[PDB]
Design a protein around this ligand. Structure first.
Ligand SMILES: [Mg+2]
Ligand SMILES: [Mg+2]
Ligand SMILES: [Mg+2]
Ligand SMILES: [Mg+2]
Ligand code: NA
Length: 140
RNA sequence: GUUUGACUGGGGCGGUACGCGCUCGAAAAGAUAUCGAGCGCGCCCUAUGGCUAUCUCAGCCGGGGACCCGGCGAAG
């Protein structure tokens, strides 16, 4: 049963929602791989009327690139609880989000016969705290 | 020397139902009138055309009315 039910980290998104950049550089070094532009939608008063327009960058890290990052990110954060997803996710911080899920996630991310992950097989906030807390730190 | 139009609950004034498109009137095929009700067209676009690749939207919810992550979401 287990082994295929135990959580794992799937991508960590580090993004700097600026409002118009030079910031990429630090993201590249803090993570280790090229950042991606963040275009914006809708015209608005913060002199942000431009639809297609660089207004920040993000970096999706997977596997080791994600751990080797969290092995310094987490320590720089304290928070826990309430600040957790209903799906077992959590964002802290410049933002750093951690998407958590169990072994059969590809089923909902592939092209052929894809399918939505059953609520039961979903990751709960609690089942999440456990996994992570059980990895160099403490909850609340 | 001539012209100075037509429509119209007489004619004139007003209007254009004088060329076109849609809903309703229209009576569950088609056709169907009034100066019937609601309201539009006389363009604009070198992309706002064409194809291919990749992709899924409104709105709401939860985590850090811009941006980022997840979730619900046949279509508003
Ligand atoms: Mg004569
Ligand atoms: Mg005369
Ligand atoms: Mg007459
Ligand atoms: Mg008929
Ligand atoms: Na005439």
């Amino acid at each position: 049963f287990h082994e295929m039910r135990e959580p794992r980290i799937e991508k960590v998104v580090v993004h700097m929602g600026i409002g118009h950049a030079n910031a990429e550089d630090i993201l590249g070094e803090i993570t280790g791989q090229m950042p991606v532009r963040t275009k914006a939608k809708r015209t608005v008063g913060e002199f942000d009327i431009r639809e297609g327009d660089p207004i920040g960058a993000k970096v999706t890290l997977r596997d080791e690139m994600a751990e080797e990052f969290l092995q310094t990110a987490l320590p720089l954060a304290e928070l826990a609880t309430s600040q957790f997803d209903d799906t077992g996710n959590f964002s802290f911080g410049l933002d750093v989000t951690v998407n958590l899920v169990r072994p059969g996630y590809r089923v909902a991310k592939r092209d052929k016969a894809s399918r939505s992950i059953p609520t039961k097989h979903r990751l709960n906030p609690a089942d999440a705290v456990a996994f992570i807390e059980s990895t160099y730190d403490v909850e609340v």
